Symmetry: D2
Subunit: 487 residues, 4 copies
């Protein structure tokens, strides 16, 4: 590919930083493209561009904004297969995933917010005959989104859709691991009629480009998706610089609770989907699987059968449903977690090594891995691995499993498998997580707010509330009576 | 002198384990009001464990059971309004004519408001398809912390604790070291109303220690802070780095008051007076940049001079006193430096500008009500929040100009316009970059009205229905009644 | 007791009709009191009084109204036992019910709405920089409530609490069978500080006093609770007269569906509470009980065992839990339905006759009655009896029972008994009823909107939506730009 | 001439079984536009069973699938705007300058609005205690019926069907016998967009038969009617008497336009003109009582007469024509009777008051733009809705008086005030008893803005988020997870 440039004010423009980076195809190790990195002056240009675009965008009618976002949706539906193939090259996720999920669910959210724009309303409050209050939900102005590498274009859509629908301009910095689909999205928005400057894309590294965005005094809000540690750094800089509003979607160590009355084929199917989709690189994954002691042996056999059915291979093949990890450095981190599990005595049920042979030696492949006989103090149980590593934990009673499920600083997701009406709601109501699934895993409708408790996040994405959280409330009192001064 | 003040943990006063104390002073006389124990790290952890136990009892009660308890606290606050106001005057130096009419009245108004809204707190339900639906719960955050400021001590304690408790949380409240006394009284009132032990704990202390221990504690889910802009940034950094906590911040401002060319100048002057000299100028929302049309500037100045001459400093318990000392000698020093900066940068001193002297003033940190005119946008007194009784008068020529200059600031808390014209009032207000906007008035903050800052003046909001919701966290729950399909 | 008068503008006043009626104690047949009946002139007097009080009431602050209603709650809590004894004398319901439910849940709704008054807000909608819309939720003005006789004071509170909380005045006409507690409520409201005229009470007969209210041109809304046929007459007259807004809470023939996995002790307890509370005089009663054929015999045995524990007797005795019907004319109608069940071939499981002996011969008693072997064409199955008559129907499959449950013009309530997560939600979602209970019956929280599908009602009571439905929306456009005429 | 128009049932045109037909007339020429089949009792029964089947398919789809189908109907309406407008002009007599700019544009605006709101239609969740909670579903009513009026035929069909379909219902729509043609076109457009067969059926006919059969049908859950006040009461009675159906009614008014003492009289005159003579005065919200201060009355009269002189009647397809004939000759007779009552009751005729005559007018149902002044509150033309181009000008002296007189009516649909004063505008508007209030404008009805009448002018509302919800019914569901306790 040609050297990739910045996207500022409706056009590709060269960065003035003089710095570049490379994105690698995780399946082959080849360089996909050299990408320009946005410097401090480039960020300031992007902000001034965004301020100008936002004024035009906010001045339009609500339905005029709705129609433009709807046109972007139509283009995304049309180009789904092209965008999915690029996403697969950049991330290593199978085309069977990217063509069915990444753009489809990203576009689902943009489509949802496009239709809600006319319903964004303030309130009116009577005080007395001679005075009343009304509120406006005003745009924040210029906001910044910082993406992660596991769902690059989906994340860009989930951040930019409510931001734009609420009347803001967004400057989006994709992950340096996966910068390519965000640049295409910028072109698509422009093609739909989005005014110049309303969506600018600045590739770069977190230490420089990301920091320049979090520090800029004229950016009113930062939305970040990534790891827990990175999030704390971003939230600190965003505070010390300009007191910015913040949204954070971080990782988790989410529990999947298998009840004593659960069907074990359904539970194993849910556990598989909660651990090995996108090669385990999903923040919401149910990586602590709690199984009753009396069912543990049978469940382990059922997991092994299904792990054997996993099909790694050509990411463009129809039957491939497992890919390499996003990068070779990330595979190293996942392997260190696997070795930590072995060294602390967790029993390796399957996997635990790289894949070898024709078509695998050049990719960042890790075998689907399951540890069992796990305990709450193990490193692989306490920490997010962000790879295909399932931990199975035995338990005896309902009160115990609720305590152990909740005994973590993470708080993103949770789930329970049970046919019992009382048990399903009773357990779910006690779990300390923002995203809860009963007898399923992973579905994230555009209507459903998602985000973390405790260290897994600040704020929410999706749902009506996220449109509102990209506005700021202005309260206005009309005093029609005579004003009284005590002086 | 009063008896030594202790910590309030789990429904009773308890000694601090820090071995540390501080004194709170009467700002009118300089006398020590009380010796106050300072909460250490171990005291904070005890307060957190107490709050965790109390919150579970509190959240398990019915919505109306919580509503009734908060309403009993409201009734006590109404009955003791005058006593609490006098204590607030002793601790802050604000006149009783203010404290007895505003501080507890509006604090209790907000608690009364949220007490009635508890049963209206609802989640949502979203159908996906015949075989699946989603519902949401607005669950309590758990243990939250409020850090108060010294200008409206008990009002802030109420504005923070009322929605936090109404949403099902426990709150640990740290009052300002300058003004800890009324928060301890409020803690007793809550218990007397039936609030379960631990649901509202109060930890006096200094910001460098007690405040930091709260922002760092791993089991506190949210920090709500009111104070200065600089102090706000520090608190927001530690709350994130420590445990990624949710945050609300109500900081200061440099709010503009825009007098339109068709305004009646007596009304404009009355609003400017109330926007600058209430609570001796120690109010975050004060309209400290007063923009007046050039053609009316001279006449407006005369009307300000007349009204400033009427300000009555004196005995804080006398009915006709309407002006008090600043809260401390260090704060007055800072205000005096801003005044000297105004003089040296070429602003014209219209009145005031000196400390007050003589019997009844020598022991307090009094500053005369001060007005500068001929001000320009680059002056330090125009650009920075002074938090004292210093009004800056700025001339302007046209509406587009005044909107630009009003918005050309990092602050964003409040704004106002004075005009009888329908189009002008709404048109100007809609363009101002502030969270709290007043048309032909200033200062009123109804319990129903969300208030907070744009830009560097804040994060989040207080009051209104939205603040009850912002003290809950959303849990989304999907019920999948169809057969789950795995692709493996 | 002394002859009961009208309550208009904060005082008892003699009716100008020259007409009176008697309310009978259903336990003894004795006259409890003579009550004056409001004539057409009395209604017009009440309306003018209500118009005057409503303006005072609406001009107060929201919290001032809240505090007054909260004081009425405090008075109702204090006088719970006194009001309940009066209610028992008037209705025949046991004190064990009236002291625990009637005033308690009436006050609960008043207390709920008192707290919501400050949350009643309009909206604000930006159109363009130069124009915006805001809305006000204004009082309707003077509204009328027409109560039923089974829960006299509770119905008076459920109608008046949202009406008053929304800033209206209400004229309340209690049922001529049970007028006494509504007059007590009017005194309590005045004692609490309600402005004169805001709650006026006009006892009378439906054929006259009710019709005069529905016809009055200055009444903006009628809220009626009663039988299906009487409801249709009221709603038509409110139209042919002055296009009034209307709410109707009518009767039902609600189905109770017992699933194949239900515990039969739980199912029998739910069926008992759904049929024999308030001697079967409850609109929401589950009077069609669907049971699986394979469990029919066992369920019948459990029902018979529980019916044997029903304790009829002194209505002021602690252990009494069954009362006479509200009147002898109503008993005659209930007995005709029972005889129809016998003649149409339903099998009588128990009861079916009046109660006899010392202490029963002078009261309007009907024994708890159960029919089984019922079919969907029977009169007792198709029509609301409003007496203690349970109909048991056998079914074979889930699709069948849903069709049969829905095959009715009534639409008030429904319920299912099952421990299965999927079955409970799946069945309930398909039932055509406004009030649905899973593994319970009868609970009606103040927060929960309640009302009928199809012929069982119009509109809802309780919940936030009912406060809003006692206001009317005014939309206000502020046009700040130059207005353009095409002429 | 057009082909004989049939019923539209279940996605296709079908012959009526009533054996009856009626004709629709071109009001500009008196010629027959088309013969139209009238739906009988059995046709209505067929339409209901079709609607029941289609509603199940429609409601089983996802929210976004329904949204996309309505959006495709929007796109077709935008493309066919001019063709539909020309048909509407032929059927109604309204100038193409109106129909091509308003009728389909604002009808499609509302459909477009509700299409996007479908996914935001949500129920609630209410916790009672740890062991029990409530959630609600906003379920479709099922089959609903809309009865349209003849002044805005396709706009009314869209304003009724858009929220009904968006909420998951099927609608059977009965257009006015005067103007049945564009509703049948809309039915074809919905099908072309993918609306499932049966979800929108159209039954032309007369009110006494087809309208009554719909209002009486036991399987129709709700009736929405737009028309005159008298007809509304008959419809609302049969609806209740038959099967207790939910009801919405948008009826007429006698809406007041209040010109304040500080109003610019050219602006006031322009608003009065647009409030009286658009669509030849055949608009329910028209400001037909114009209250003018006594001191300005003579000058206002002059400005009205000057603008009336500019009204351009003529070829309804000419760009500059802005005034049309009335919808029918019987309606013109009613308007002429009202005009004659104004003369005989002593109101002063300023202009108009007769039919228009000459080539191009003798065959149309034309009435000249008419203005009465010196009107009093007891006159028939002041108390009753005329639904023609007849403005009544009434003098007044003070604000309290004009508010009382504005409100002293059984009608309640709209109202407006002309004033530049902030306090006067809101203060007056807050006291008027009308559902639709305009400040310094008239007639704009945004899709976001709920509209409907107080008192005898209506029941319920159209447009806005609340109208989507009012086409659903609430089911409350309690989940009891604790042990159930029986007292028996
Ligand atoms: N909105 C404000 C402004 C000031 N202060 C008080 O006044 C002191 C001095 O004012 P200022 O220097 O403006 O406060 P900050 O911006 O917080 O800066 P610093 O940390 O230097 O005090 C603060 O420490 C605080 O005690 C306050 O409570 N609220
Ligand atoms: N849900 C019900 C059913 C009945 N009733 C009372 O019982 C009487 C007779 O019952 P029913 O025939 O069901 O009432 P309607 O259908 O209204 O018929 P009618 O015109 O005979 O009263 C009603 O008038 C009313 O006093 C009631 O209050 N609530
Ligand atoms: N707001 C209005 C007023 C009138 N009309 C039409 O004009 C006719 C005659 O007007 P009017 O007498 O005012 O109508 P109603 O009050 O309904 O009385 P009627 O029953 O005599 O038609 C109505 O039948 C209707 O076709 C209308 O559609 N909308």
């Amino acid at each position: 590919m040609a050297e990739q440039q910045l996207y500022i004010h409706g056009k590709f423009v060269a960065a003035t930083s003089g710095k570049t980076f490379e994105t690698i195809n995780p399946a082959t190790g080849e360089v996909l493209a050299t990408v320009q990195a946005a410097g401090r002056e480039d960020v300031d240009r992007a902000v001034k561009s965004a301020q100008q675009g936002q004024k035009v965008w906010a001045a339009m009618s609500a339905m005029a904004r709705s129609r433009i976002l709807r046109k972007a949706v139509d283009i995304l539906r049309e180009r789904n297969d092209e965008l999915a193939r690029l996403e697969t090259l950049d991330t290593g996720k199978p085309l069977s995933e990217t063509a069915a999920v990444d753009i489809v669910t990203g576009a689902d959210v943009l489509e949802y917010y496009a239709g809600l724009i006319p319903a964004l309303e303030g309130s009116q409050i009577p005080l007395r005959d001679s005075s009343f209050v009304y509120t406006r939900r005003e745009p924040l102005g210029v906001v910044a989104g910082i993406g992660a590498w596991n769902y690059p274009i989906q994340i860009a859509l989930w951040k930019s859709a409510p931001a734009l629908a609420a009347g803001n301009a967004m400057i989006f910095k994709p992950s340096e691991v996966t910068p390519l689909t965000a640049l295409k999205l910028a072109e698509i928005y422009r093609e739909a009629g989005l005014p110049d400057g309303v969506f600018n894309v600045l590739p770069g590294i977190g230490a420089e480009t990301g920091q320049y965005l979090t520090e800029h005094p004229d950016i009113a809000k930062i939305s970040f998706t990534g790891g827990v540690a990175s999030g704390k750094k971003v939230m600190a800089n965003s505070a010390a610089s300009s007191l910015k509003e913040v949204t954070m979607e971080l990782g988790g160590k989410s529990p999947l609770i298998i009840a004593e009355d659960a069907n074990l084929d359904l539970a194993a199917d849910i556990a598989m989907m909660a651990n090995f989709y996108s090669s385990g690189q999903v923040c919401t994954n149910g990586t602590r699987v709690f199984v009753p002691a009396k069912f543990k042996a049978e469940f382990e056999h059922k997991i092994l059968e299904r792990v054997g059915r996993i099909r790694a291979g050509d990411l463009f093949a129809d039957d491939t449903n497992f890919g390499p990890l996003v990068s070779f450095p990330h595979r190293q981190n996942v392997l260190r977690y696997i070795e930590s599990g072995k060294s602390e005595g967790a029993r390796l049920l399957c996997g635990g090594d790289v894949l070898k042979g024709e078509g695998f030696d050049n990719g960042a492949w890790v075998a689907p891995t399951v540890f069992t006989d796990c305990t709450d103090d193990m490193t692989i149980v306490r920490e997010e691995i962000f790879g295909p590593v399932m931990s199975i934990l035995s338990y005896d009673d309902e009160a115990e499993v609720i305590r152990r499920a909740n005994a973590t600083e993470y708080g993103l997701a949770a789930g329970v498998v049970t046919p019992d009406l009382n048990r399903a709601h009773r357990i779910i109501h006690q779990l300390e997580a923002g995203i809860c699934w009963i007898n399923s895993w992973g579905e994230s409708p555009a209507e459903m707010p998602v985000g973390g408790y405790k260290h897994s996040g600040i704020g929410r994405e999706n749902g009506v509330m996220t449109l509102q959280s990209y506005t700021q409330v202005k309260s206005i009192q009309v005093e029609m009576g005579p004003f009284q001064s005590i002086f």
